[PDB]
Amino acid sequence: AIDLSRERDPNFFDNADIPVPECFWFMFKNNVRQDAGTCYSSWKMDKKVGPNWVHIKSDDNCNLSGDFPPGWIVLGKKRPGF
Amino acid sequence: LKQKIVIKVAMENNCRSKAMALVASTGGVDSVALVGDLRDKIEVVGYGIDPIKLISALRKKVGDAELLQVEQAKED
Amino acid sequence: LKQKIVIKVAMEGNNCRSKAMALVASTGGVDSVALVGDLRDKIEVVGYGIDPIKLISALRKKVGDAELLQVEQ
């Protein structure tokens, strides 16, 4: 049911004076999209995932891992040009 | 160096103009931007921003606010 | 109707910088406001149905001088 190839790009703003984050992320509850944004590859962000803060790691190809509360996932994708 | 933060604020009079204005006015802010699938989130980038003092300030002047994201700038 | 507007403003301290970012950011149809330039002395505003005439007029009243560097669409 979750196919990132059919997900519209998130709304974003790339600050001019820090590096461009390489990844799009997409947050689902029971396979329904809740939101999307950007994050760095080979990195980490702290994200409120429904009720809980989750430490989410990113690898060099924008695969995200983290301890998602039941029913929720955050999935990664390389933005065009990376 | 720089932190990236995302804030959901309730924006329904001109709570949109107020939230941006208040956030834009805060020490160390480099950029404020309307983001998220429904343009209901403010993404802020800068140095020495207390996210909790900022959430608190918004709750006081605009209406409801919720920190949703903190990411350090990857500089290399 | 998608605009980028870069304004050089006289911001001689923490307060004037705050007041100017407050005022640009409060303008109708602003999507984003960024301090830009090597010296953080320019305000980039992006959005929709922003009037650059009034934006300039207002800044000029409140914070210090303001010059229009860029409007592109």
Residue numbers in the entry:
A (entry chain C): 32 to 113
B (entry chain B): 187 to 198, 200 to 263
C (entry chain A): 187 to 259
Task: Reproduce, without paraphrasing, sentences from the article in which this PDB structure was first reported.
The rice NLR receptor Pik-1 binds the Magnaporthe oryzae effector AVR-Pik through an integrated heavy metal-associated (HMA) domain. The sensor NLR Pik-1 contains an integrated HMA domain between the CC and NB-ARC domains. Direct binding of AVR-Pik to the HMA domain is required to activate Pik-mediated immunity. However, the stealthy alleles AVR-PikC and AVR-PikF avoid interaction with Pik-HMA and evade host defenses.
